[PDB]
């Protein structure tokens, strides 16, 4: 938004004062699950687990879902960048005193194109910002449901995003629940 007149390889000119695209989550700094808020102690990913057993407690990140989230967000940003083309040389014209209608037509064309492109850019950013946050919420919900559909009756759901085991299981059980391969018959 510096100047309409440019020479060389230049970005597209708009009348906007702010165009920011979200790639991460809502910042809600609130041990309980995702219903209360976010974790500042988890740094290596977007979604993850916190475990507590006889040998200790700690945070871990789910490497699997973060990868698909990053893939989708990167694809979206690249598509947005690609749909807009770079501006080439575009300078003004000159007219004498008996050529006012041509000057007015030139001004009308320039103003109309500028209005249309400003509208397009602002609308695109505004509409993508909501879909990103919905995407993140759906990812967290899917991870929670995937974990809940693996313990069945051997655990109690306390309603804040956490599960309490009825049996006692060491670090191997935790690493197997966070793995996708959990032996329900073994602990029944």
């Amino acid at each position, epitope marked *: 938004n510096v100047h309409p007149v440019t020479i060389g390889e230049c970005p597209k000119y708009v009348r906007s004062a702010k165009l920011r695209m979200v790639t991460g989550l809502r910042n809600i700094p609130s041990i309980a699950g995702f219903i209360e808020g976010g974790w500042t102690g988890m740094v290596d990913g977007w979604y993850g687990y916190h475990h507590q057993n006889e040998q200790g407690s700690g945070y871990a990140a789910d*490497q699997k879902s973060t990868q698909n989230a990053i*893939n989708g*967000i*990167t694809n979206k940003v*690249n598509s947005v*960048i690609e749909k807009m083309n770079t501006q080439f040389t575009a300078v003004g014209k000159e007219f004498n005193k008996l050529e006012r209608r041509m000057e007015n037509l030139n001004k009308k064309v320039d103003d109309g194109f500028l209005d249309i492109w400003t509208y397009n850019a602002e609308l695109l950013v505004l509409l993508e910002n909501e879909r990103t946050l919905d995407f993140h919420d759906s990812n967290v919900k899917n991870l929670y449901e995937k974990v809940k559909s693996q313990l069945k009756n051997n655990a109690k759901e306390i309603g804040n995003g956490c599960f309490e085991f009825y049996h006692k299981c060491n670090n191997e059980c935790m690493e197997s629940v966070k793995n996708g391969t959990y032996d329900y018959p073994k602990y029944s």
Partner: antibody
Amino acid sequence: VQLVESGAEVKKPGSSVKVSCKASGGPFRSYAISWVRQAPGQGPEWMGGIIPIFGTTKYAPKFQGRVTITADDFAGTVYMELSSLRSEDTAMYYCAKHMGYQVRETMDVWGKGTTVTV
Amino acid sequence: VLTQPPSVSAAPGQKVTISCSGSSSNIGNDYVSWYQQLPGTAPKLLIYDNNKRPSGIPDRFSGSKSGTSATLGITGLQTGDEANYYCATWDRRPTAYVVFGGGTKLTVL
């Protein structure tokens, strides 16, 4: 995906050198990028890497303090700067890519490499 | 660090195993990857995830890891299978970093 480094450099001891790596495709990547070096008659040594989106940078204890890795995303470039050059810094440098967003021991795509002589 | 034999040699069409003995911090708690380096070229990934092969890698290459020591096995040796071989892993205790092996020269006869 193709990774292209910059040209060769001839530097003097005590100076600093900055090199760049450019990756084909979309400007934004979903994988981490690492820098490796190899001296003639020796084996590879890992220097450090950078992570997408989060922007975290990791370095090696041998190279910690003297090396700086940065990235520019809208042009798809990764820069590495090394300072306080010595005679043992003469080596060939590669930029390598990982399969995931995390810096691990498995790199599947390497660059041609560029030589730095002191 | 990861220790490998400095040089192993065998006749064409034979079977060769290259070892590497680290410690419980590097290999005993993480995966191992195997790279090949021809002269004048960048290293090429051979084995990852301790037994997996990327697309384009022939079946005659294989890998395994028992306890602390990993092994890379090559069968049906040719003249073009003479290069340097490196084992790499992700050391993690004081400050995590990638560690490569010492390297092993494979000479054919």
